[PDB]
Amino acid sequence: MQIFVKTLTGKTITLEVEPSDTIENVKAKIQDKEGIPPDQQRLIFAGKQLEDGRTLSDYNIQKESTLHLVLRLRGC
Template sequence: MDITITMLDGTAHTLVVDPDKTVGDLKKLIHVKFGVAPNTQRLMFVNGQTVTLSEDTRKIHPSFQVFVRNDKGKTNTYDTSPDETVHKFKSRVEHREGVAVSQQRLVFQGREMMDGTLSDYGVKEHSTIDLCLRLRGG
């Protein structure tokens, strides 16, 4: 994947990195290519998520966009990552769509998403997830 590095002076450089590498590996590469010591680097993803020095062993997982289609056919775009939990994602859907987590059924490729992470269900960039409402009854 391509990562754009913006220096403090505003110059931008593009590096090709393996997304399975760690943040520490990326910092070493920046040090080799541009002479910036790893302990002075502050890395941020495009979505503004800060990666601090204590997270050097963390894998580089890019954020990506998915689509959520509601029961009326309206589609909204969400920025997410493969390791986001289904519960956290449902909470964000609740905030934006106004549907309580307890009333949501998120379905991707015919499978209801219950627990785990989005990657556990094979959700990738530009995937469409259907938001279905639970039937109320008694």
């Protein structure tokens, strides 16, 4: 029910989400908690980037499992 989302700037972010829904739903949860729109997010679980329509147990992501979030940003 609780999964962690860790990022390149160091952060962990707990996300409560009964593992049975969709990846766009995790993206929406992260947008609410940190304001980053969904379309700036790439979600990777265990060396696998996650497709939207694919569901959370499609990718066997269980509770306490951890997802890595990389942002489609870049600077000069």
